[PDB]
């Protein structure tokens, strides 16, 4: 049994099932189609959610290409739109990837 524990928002409960795709199902943790079985989900408002705000979880928003399934992603290289290099402070076509 490979138990994977992670916290996701309550709007993306539908995509966790095998087969579906999206911004979360292909950029961060893609589930193979041949995945036999299901998942376990429950609310965590009383445990993780806080009135003062919780900022302990993150996920990828931009990628050069779709990653290989079940291959861990660790490196957090910055992303750019134009071909001109950007460094120092923000500017034109220079945005924070995450």
């Amino acid at each position, epitope marked *: 049994v490979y138990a994977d524990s992670f916290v996701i928002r309550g709007d993306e409960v539908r995509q966790i099932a095998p087969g579906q795709t999206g911004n979360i199902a292909d950029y961060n943790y893609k589930l193979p189609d041949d995945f036999t079985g299901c998942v376990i989900a429950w609310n965590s408002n009383k445990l993780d959610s806080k*009135v003062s*705000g919780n900022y302990n979880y993150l996920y990828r928003l931009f990628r050069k290409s779709n990653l290989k399934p079940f291959e861990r992603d660790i490196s957090t290289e910055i992303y750019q739109a134009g071909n001109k290099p950007c460094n120092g402070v923000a500017g034109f076509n220079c945005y924070f990837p995450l």
Partner: antibody
Amino acid sequence: QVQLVQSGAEVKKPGASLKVSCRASGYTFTSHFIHWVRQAPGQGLEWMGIINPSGGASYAQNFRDRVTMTTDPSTSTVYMELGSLRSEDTAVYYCARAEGSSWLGWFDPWGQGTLVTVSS
Amino acid sequence: SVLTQPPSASGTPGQRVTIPCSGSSSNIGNNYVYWYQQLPGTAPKLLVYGNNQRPSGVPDRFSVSKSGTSASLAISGLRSEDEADYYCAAWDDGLSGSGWVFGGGTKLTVL
């Protein structure tokens, strides 16, 4: 004495703003959350806003983008500014407090309440 | 106004007074129920919390029970001074917003 003091709403003019100061006495400010309660005449209790003793805040869903509300851990006082007055203001407001852990907590302190009436 | 509360209650003298507080499973079935007694012109006060522990100095003449997704308050030996206001408090999740929505208010009349 352990009491939360808030000034009542006075008469004003269209285009002006109402300032209400809520001050906690008898206990440390950074020990209880600050909560807003509304009660209309012949009606139950409604709640608007939350201000933590030290942290962020939760505004009013209905009264958003036009109510100024913040915190200041210097004089243990908070200030609420109201603009664009309307006849819906006629109620009594409680600047109350709750437990230090929210959710399942005891509402040990209560406020006297401010009577707000707007009419033309 | 999702919650429903009787406008008033009537009954012959010498009969036990039963008040039903019924809602959903999110606020009563899945959450604890708070029982408040509110005096006319006075801020509400918490009297019953958690259905298991009670504050000291409260006589046991009042009784409270929870069945299914509802609760019942039973008072035996009604007196003339029992005319007050009673509030149910629980955590509810609303489409517009989720929070602590209280009741409207119950008024009793004695002839």
